[PDB]
């Protein structure tokens, strides 16, 4: 799915208010622009990786799916390293234009 037509500001607000908190509490690469970043979050959150495959059902993953479904037309150890990369991608997504 191409994230070119998404509403990036509402997704960013949802992350900064809600998704980021769950993403940090779960702890207990880069991207060029906003669509590429969102592609990276989608792939790195909902597509299973080597070993850390159960990340798609986490609560922050539910939040990401909810935000993407609402604001993207037509959308609807190793784990710590993956979530750190996800935090980096989200942080670069929130970068001002």
């Amino acid at each position, epitope marked *: 799915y191409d994230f070119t037509n998404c509403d990036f500001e509402k997704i960013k607000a949802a992350y*900064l*208010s809600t998704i980021s908190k769950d993403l940090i509490t779960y702890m207990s690469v*880069s991207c060029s622009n906003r669509p590429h970043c969102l592609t990276e979050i989608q792939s790195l959150t909902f597509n299973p990786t080597a070993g850390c495959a159960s990340l798609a059902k986490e609560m922050f993953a539910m939040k990401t799916k909810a935000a993407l479904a609402i604001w993207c037309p037509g959308y609807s150890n190793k784990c710590l390293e993956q979530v750190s990369q996800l935090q980096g991608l989200w*942080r670069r997504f929130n970068r*001002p234009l």
Partner: antibody
Amino acid sequence: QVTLKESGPVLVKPTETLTLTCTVSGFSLSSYDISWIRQPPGKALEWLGVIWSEGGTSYSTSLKSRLTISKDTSKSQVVLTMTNMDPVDTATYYCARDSDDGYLNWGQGTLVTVSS
Amino acid sequence: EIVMTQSPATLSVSPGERATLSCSVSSSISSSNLHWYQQKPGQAPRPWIYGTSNLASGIPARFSGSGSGTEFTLTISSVQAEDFAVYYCQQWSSYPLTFGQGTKLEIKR
């Protein structure tokens, strides 16, 4: 904890070159992007410019031709170089790590006096 | 750039009263994109309010924020002696970052 410390206060002759070094601790330069903001004495904060985590850089439109922000992640240093100084450039310069929540997360600030 | 203005330039409020500081943005920005900083003379600015509504670490409950689109406000319910300082609103929407001219909340007598 996140700390940003610029170099000491400096005196720069007019039409010389300012070089400020900001050493940061508590985070990596490859994950956070560092902005430089100057405040003239008694005036509002002026955003000089940012260097990004992946290596890109953006500068203020008025001061684009003079600014140069370089980064060394090995030494954890951000270097601001400003050329052709004017006595109107004396100010307090801050290096600020644009945080996860977006707040600048300012440094200590160094006084620069541009006078002959 | 996004040219964003603060009102009033100077706010005369006696201690214990209610203070309201307005920030008006030339273009509509997201609520999470506005931050408030407090600066005292001879000191660096301090991150003070996050995303128009979220207090930072250590800032007491007296301070609150509320706004959307163009208009945002920082409100102190009971101004104390330590709350007299220069408050800056800053946009995080797009480059270049722009700050308000600053509102000097100062003691009225």
